[PDB]
Amino acid sequence: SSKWLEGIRKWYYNAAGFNKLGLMRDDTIHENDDVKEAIRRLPENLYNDRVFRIKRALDLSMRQQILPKEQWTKYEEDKFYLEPYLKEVIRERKEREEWTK
Template identity: 60%
Template sequence: MAVKSTGRLMRWMQKVYYNQAGFNQFGLMADDTLRQTPEVIEAVRRLPADTYNQRAFRIKRALDLSLKHRILPSEQWTKFEEDVRYLKPYLEEVEREMKEKADWNAR
């Protein structure tokens, strides 16, 4: 019983943090806000064209809104439940490849 309530509490805390971060008010997803490390840059380069274009649109729209000191109407905000970690599989692959390359170079 305690595990279920702990899980619900964690989920609630995640939602609160997600909404407090504010990037969703610009229509961004969590993966759109990742710091541009070499791994992230390579993962973004590997995205399919349609996913890459959607990401670019969200970032350009967010920049435009930010410059105008505006946010999207609340019905257009990215919802916690709808935010997909689209970059995660590519990022994991890149990190695995970089680790393997470093292991080979260390020999």
């Protein structure tokens, strides 16, 4: 049932690897310009925390070294912050397209 799909999700989140460099979900997003608008529109404190986590990740991958066991961001306590903002940017994209057609 629904419990099994969530267990697949938890396995995949552990085997993905971006919890071993301390990152969170909304820090691996590939940039179009919509992503760039969503990154522009952030509140300041989470933007600073984003750049700190990114900079630790680039450091650790520079010396190709994984964080300890204890500092891994465990599943479903990471902040899913970008999906409102990126959702609204894509919504305005669809709005431009449906208005000009």
